[PDB]
Amino acid sequence: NKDLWIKEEIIWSEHKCIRFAAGGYEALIIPDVGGNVVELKDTNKGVTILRTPKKDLKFEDFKNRPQVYGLPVLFPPNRIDDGTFKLGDKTYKFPINEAKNNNYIHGFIKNSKWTVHKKKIDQDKALVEVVFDFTKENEAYKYFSHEFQFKLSYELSSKGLKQTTSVVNLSSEEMPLSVGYHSAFNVPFIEGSEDSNCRVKISIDKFWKQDSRNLPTGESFAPTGEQKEYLENGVAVASHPIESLFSLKDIDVNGKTFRGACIEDASKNTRVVYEMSSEYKYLVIWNDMGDKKYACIEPQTSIINSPNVKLDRSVSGFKTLKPNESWSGVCKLYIENM
C-alpha cells in the first residue's frame, strides 16, 4: 500500500536519518545519536507518542542530552555508585558523569554514532536495524575492556512499533550487563487535549526507596498512597514532580498477561501502550517536575546500581554475559481505543 515505505534523508543539514512507515504509523530514527527513534506517530489518529526535538533545537544540544527525547538506549540504565563496581576480583572504575551525587549514569551509547544495519519492507511491515560496534579502538575501551555489539531492531506494522534490543559479548571475558531505556513520552499525545487529561498506569510490584544520592537503600515496599493508582485508575502524571523506582510484575488485562505501562486520555478515548518483555524487571518514572508536557517511563533489566546492591541476582536482575553470549529484550508501542 501507499503507507508502507522507508526513506533515508538528511536532517540537521548533514546527518542521515531514516523515516519509516507501515500500517498507518510513521517513525523517525537518528543513527548518529544513539539510534534514537525520536518520533512515532499515527497521523490519521492525530497521535504522536514520543517526545520529538522541536525545529529550533540544534543538533549539538540534542547530541549532548538525547535522553529527554524518543527512545534513548541505556547501558547501564541509571546510576553506578562512585562510578565503580567489582565483578569477581575485577574492578571497573568509570569517570564520574553525575557530579552532584558522584555517580556514573546512563552510559555513552545513547550519545554515540550507530550505523544502519538493515532496511527492509516485507509483507506490510517496515524493518530498520541499527548497530553499535564497540571495539578495542574506542576511547572508552580502557574503562570497560569488552568488545561488544549492540543492535536495535525496529519493526513497524499495523500493530505499532516492535523494538528488539540485543547485545552480544564479543570479548574473551565475562561481561557485566544491565540495559534500559530513558523513553520520553508526550503528555498529552493528541491535539485538543491537556496534560491534566492523561493518566499513567504501570504494572508495578514493589516501590524501592532511594537515598539522597538517588541510590537504592535496598528496602522495598508495597505501593502506598498515590502509587496504588498505577494499578487502578492511573496517576495524573502532570500534577506534581515524580521520580520513582519500581519493580515490575505481570498483571491480567482482558484475559491476557501484560507487563508495562500505558497513558490513557479518556477525553479522547485513546490509550498509548508501552508493553515490555519479562527481561525488563524494574522501571523508573520521572516527569521532569511535571510541567514540560512529557514524562519518562524507563524500563530496566535490573535495579539502579545493581552491580553493588546486597541482594541476590534473582532479585537485583544484575546479569553477566559469557563470551559470545547474547541478551535480548522486546518492547512494543501502540495506540488503541478505550
Side-chain angles (χ1 to χ4, degrees), residues 3-54 56-89 91-338:
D3 63 350
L4 177 69
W5 48 264
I6 301 177
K7 179 176 185 177
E8 179 171 337
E9 67 199 288
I10 298 309
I11 189 168
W12 277 299
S13 309
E14 48 174 18
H15 302 275
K16 293 182 226 152
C17 70
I18 309 290
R19 207 170 299 270
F20 56 119
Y25 292 87
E26 181 179 323
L28 176 59
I29 192 171
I30 315 298
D32 276 347
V33 187
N36 190 323
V37 180
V38 297
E39 198 172 53
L40 177 63
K41 59 191 191 170
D42 183 323
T43 58
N44 287 339
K45 293 186 183 189
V47 171
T48 175
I49 297 176
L50 297 167
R51 192 199 192 208
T52 311
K54 290 165 183 293
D56 73 305
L57 189 71
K58 296 196 298 194
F59 177 79
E60 204 63 20
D61 295 329
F62 176 53
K63 173 173 78 182
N64 283 336
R65 200 198 184 188
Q67 63 267 25
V68 298
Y69 296 101
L71 297 177
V73 67
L74 310 175
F75 182 52
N78 215 286
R79 297 158 175 90
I80 308 303
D81 183 357
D82 293 342
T84 189
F85 66 90
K86 295 191 79 187
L87 183 65
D89 59 21
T91 304
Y92 291 87
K93 191 187 200 308
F94 311 148
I96 296 302
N97 68 347
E98 194 203 8
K100 162 182 146 69
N101 294 319
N102 203 61
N103 294 320
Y104 186 77
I105 197 176
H106 294 326
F108 55 85
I109 64 178
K110 63 187 197 313
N111 307 96
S112 293
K113 299 194 197 190
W114 292 55
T115 59
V116 174
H117 177 74
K118 188 184 297 201
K119 297 180 292 162
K120 180 170 189 274
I121 56 177
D122 186 47
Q123 318 233 211
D124 297 351
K125 303 170 193 301
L127 177 70
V128 174
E129 304 189 336
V130 292
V131 296
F132 181 73
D133 300 302
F134 186 72
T135 74
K136 290 169 182 299
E137 308 319 315
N138 196 292
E139 70 165 34
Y141 190 81
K142 62 182 137 289
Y143 303 106
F144 189 76
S145 303
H146 302 275
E147 293 192 308
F148 67 81
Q149 184 183 74
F150 245 93
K151 178 160 51 205
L152 313 180
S153 183
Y154 285 106
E155 171 203 289
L156 195 56
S157 76
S158 72
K159 296 174 286 176
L161 184 68
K162 184 167 97 154
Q163 169 194 265
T164 303
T165 308
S166 56
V167 54
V168 56
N169 176 12
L170 298 173
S171 84
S172 64
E173 295 175 287
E174 203 187 3
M175 191 189 90
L177 178 74
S178 178
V179 179
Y181 279 86
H182 203 295
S183 312
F185 291 92
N186 288 317
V187 182
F189 53 72
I190 187 153
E191 221 76 284
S193 187
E194 222 71 74
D195 55 6
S196 58
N197 295 348
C198 291
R199 305 285 202 157
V200 176
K201 298 167 176 187
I202 306 170
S203 59
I204 60 170
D205 187 3
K206 299 192 277 172
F207 174 71
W208 294 79
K209 187 175 168 164
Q210 289 169 268
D211 68 14
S212 65
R213 292 174 61 211
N214 290 333
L215 302 165
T217 69
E219 299 162 282
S220 63
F221 305 83
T224 54
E226 183 182 64
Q227 303 168 355
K228 295 192 191 175
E229 298 167 40
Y230 290 119
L231 294 167
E232 291 303 321
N233 291 124
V235 168
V237 61
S239 53
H240 57 82
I242 290 167
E243 185 179 349
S244 296
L245 172 62
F246 296 100
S247 48
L248 293 176
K249 61 174 193 192
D250 301 351
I251 61 172
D252 298 312
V253 179
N254 293 320
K256 198 185 193 316
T257 61
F258 176 81
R259 177 185 294 219
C262 73
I263 310 174
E264 288 181 0
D265 189 338
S267 84
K268 298 293 187 174
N269 204 58
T270 310
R271 178 185 296 111
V272 168
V273 182
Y274 188 18
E275 187 168 3
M276 307 160 192
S277 71
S278 297
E279 284 80 15
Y280 296 104
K281 300 186 187 303
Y282 286 85
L283 179 147
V284 167
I285 177 168
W286 171 75
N287 66 355
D288 198 357
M289 308 308 284
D291 62 348
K292 302 178 189 57
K293 315 291 178 206
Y294 84 108
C296 295
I297 298 174
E298 313 178 19
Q300 312 187 164
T301 58
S302 70
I303 198 169
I304 296 180
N305 195 36
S306 69
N308 287 313
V309 295
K310 296 182 179 179
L311 298 168
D312 71 42
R313 292 199 191 174
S314 64
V315 173
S316 78
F318 179 64
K319 293 185 101 305
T320 64
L321 291 179
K322 293 184 175 71
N324 209 50
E325 194 182 5
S326 73
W327 170 94
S328 177
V330 180
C331 295
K332 294 176 185 181
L333 281 171
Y334 48 100
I335 305 159
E336 63 183 25
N337 295 336
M338 297 177 49

